[PDB]
Design an enzyme around this catalytic site. Structure first.
Site, PDB file in Angstrom:
ATOM      1  N   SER A 153      26.004  18.466  66.094  1.00 29.32           N
ATOM      2  CA  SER A 153      25.882  17.272  66.932  1.00 29.32           C
ATOM      3  C   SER A 153      24.588  17.185  67.705  1.00 29.32           C
ATOM      4  O   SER A 153      24.357  16.142  68.332  1.00 29.32           O
ATOM      5  CB  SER A 153      27.017  17.169  67.949  1.00 29.32           C
ATOM      6  OG  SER A 153      28.239  16.834  67.332  1.00 29.32           O
ATOM      7  N   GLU A 197      30.014  15.134  57.298  1.00 33.82           N
ATOM      8  CA  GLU A 197      29.493  15.987  56.224  1.00 33.82           C
ATOM      9  C   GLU A 197      28.323  16.859  56.665  1.00 33.82           C
ATOM     10  O   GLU A 197      28.123  17.943  56.100  1.00 33.82           O
ATOM     11  CB  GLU A 197      29.071  15.148  55.010  1.00 33.82           C
ATOM     12  CG  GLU A 197      30.239  14.524  54.279  1.00 33.82           C
ATOM     13  CD  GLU A 197      30.735  13.185  54.852  1.00 33.82           C
ATOM     14  OE1 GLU A 197      30.144  12.610  55.810  1.00 33.82           O
ATOM     15  OE2 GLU A 197      31.753  12.693  54.313  1.00 33.82           O
ATOM     16  N   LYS A 231      22.294  14.115  67.817  1.00 35.03           N
ATOM     17  CA  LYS A 231      22.654  12.877  68.497  1.00 35.03           C
ATOM     18  C   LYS A 231      21.779  12.606  69.711  1.00 35.03           C
ATOM     19  O   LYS A 231      21.611  11.452  70.101  1.00 35.03           O
ATOM     20  CB  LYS A 231      24.146  12.893  68.885  1.00 35.03           C
ATOM     21  CG  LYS A 231      25.094  12.922  67.703  1.00 35.03           C
ATOM     22  CD  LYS A 231      26.525  13.272  68.089  1.00 35.03           C
ATOM     23  CE  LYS A 231      27.369  13.430  66.827  1.00 35.03           C
ATOM     24  NZ  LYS A 231      28.647  14.122  67.064  1.00 35.03           N
ATOM     25  N   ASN A 272      31.443  10.845  67.413  1.00 33.83           N
ATOM     26  CA  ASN A 272      31.014  10.777  66.010  1.00 33.83           C
ATOM     27  C   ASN A 272      30.932   9.357  65.485  1.00 33.83           C
ATOM     28  O   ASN A 272      29.978   9.016  64.781  1.00 33.83           O
ATOM     29  CB  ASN A 272      31.920  11.603  65.120  1.00 33.83           C
ATOM     30  CG  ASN A 272      31.563  13.061  65.157  1.00 33.83           C
ATOM     31  OD1 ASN A 272      30.391  13.430  65.142  1.00 33.83           O
ATOM     32  ND2 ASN A 272      32.567  13.905  65.138  1.00 33.83           N
ATOM     33  N   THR A 299      28.079  21.730  67.655  1.00 36.28           N
ATOM     34  CA  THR A 299      29.082  22.693  67.197  1.00 36.28           C
ATOM     35  C   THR A 299      29.522  22.285  65.795  1.00 36.28           C
ATOM     36  O   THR A 299      30.133  21.233  65.635  1.00 36.28           O
ATOM     37  CB  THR A 299      30.293  22.703  68.141  1.00 36.28           C
ATOM     38  OG1 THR A 299      29.861  22.882  69.480  1.00 36.28           O
ATOM     39  CG2 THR A 299      31.230  23.847  67.808  1.00 36.28           C
ATOM     40  N   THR A 351      24.545  19.415  73.196  1.00 37.58           N
ATOM     41  CA  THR A 351      25.160  20.489  72.434  1.00 37.58           C
ATOM     42  C   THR A 351      25.333  20.128  70.952  1.00 37.58           C
ATOM     43  O   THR A 351      25.236  18.974  70.526  1.00 37.58           O
ATOM     44  CB  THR A 351      26.560  20.797  72.996  1.00 37.58           C
ATOM     45  OG1 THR A 351      27.378  19.623  72.902  1.00 37.58           O
ATOM     46  CG2 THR A 351      26.513  21.228  74.430  1.00 37.58           C
TER      47      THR A 351
END
EC number: 3.5.2.6
Length: 271
Positions: free
Chosen positions: A47, A145, A50, A109, A214, A212
């Site tokens: 992520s 993905e 982003k 997301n 993950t 962050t």
């Protein structure tokens, strides 16, 4: 060269106890001193892309007045797992600015995929990063993905060094115009997902913004941040991890510990 790793820190022991690899790049923007460990290796973004996505949207808003105010309606088919903000506005829509804040501050997301579409997809975000001088970053796929984190796969990766360099350009340098730069900083400062990562190494009376990542596999997780210690120039840093086995777990504590070592290596008095 001469200002890199003036003071050695036990990163190797930290990653060995973790059971994987840790990559760190931290820069004191006052003196230019740096701490660097595996800093030019590739690690999955997860992520963490982003944050750069939101910056790219802000850059576009400099040429498209009113972009940030545009209302975006989306269907249930846009709501991929871990979309904690956009699921609450499915029946109403959200603005581009709100989607950007959700992507940064909640790792949302669905918001990230909607904004990627605005930019022309993974290649469009990659192009924005090239435009600020980052030749390392690559985004290849969409959420979810892009989380596969396959060992040796360069898709959807960057390096700690390039992440820090780009973060500095966007938050402190001239890559964004001043209002957009401060908006990007403000979104990072309002992040909610990073309390156990770099922030856990940063004294409570210092300002900090972070993003962050993950992936959920291969011990792969990360954080990057701008930190404003009082009385001195800001520090930019990135901490990325991975591990050899698919079911290896990530560790937030290891990220915080690596950030502590980076600050110690820069001689920044902290915790």
């Amino acid at each position: 060269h001469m200002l890199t790793n003036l003071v050695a820190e036990p990163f190797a022991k930290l990653e060995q106890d973790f059971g994987g690899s840790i990559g760190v790049y931290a820069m004191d923007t006052g003196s230019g001193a740096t701490v660097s460990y595996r800093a030019e290796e590739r690690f999955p973004l997860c992520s963490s892309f982003k944050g750069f996505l939101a910056a790219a949207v802000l850059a576009r808003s400099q040429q498209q007045a009113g972009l940030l105010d545009t209302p975006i309606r989306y269907g249930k088919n846009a709501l991929v797992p871990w979309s904690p903000i956009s699921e609450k506005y499915l029946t109403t829509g959200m603005t581009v600015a709100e989607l950007s804040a959700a992507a940064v501050q909640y790792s949302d997301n669905a918001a990230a995929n909607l904004l990627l579409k605005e930019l022309g997809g993974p290649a469009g975000l990659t192009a924005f990063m090239r435009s600020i001088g980052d030749t390392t970053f690559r985004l290849d796929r969409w959420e979810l993905e892009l989380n596969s984190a396959i060992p040796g796969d360069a898709r959807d990766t960057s390096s700690p060094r390039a992440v820090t360099e780009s973060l500095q350009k966007l938050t402190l340098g001239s890559a964004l115009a001043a209002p957009q730069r401060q908006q990007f900083v403000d979104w990072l400062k309002g992040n909610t997902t990073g309390n156990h990562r770099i922030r856990a190494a940063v004294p409570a009376d210092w300002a900090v913004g972070d993003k962050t990542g993950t992936c959920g596999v291969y011990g792969t997780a990360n954080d990057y941040a701008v930190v404003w210690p009082t009385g001195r120039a800001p520090i930019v840093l990135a901490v990325y991890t991975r591990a050899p086995n698919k079911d290896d777990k990530h560790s937030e504590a290891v990220i915080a510990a690596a950030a502590r070592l980076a600050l110690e290596g820069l001689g920044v008095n902290g915790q």
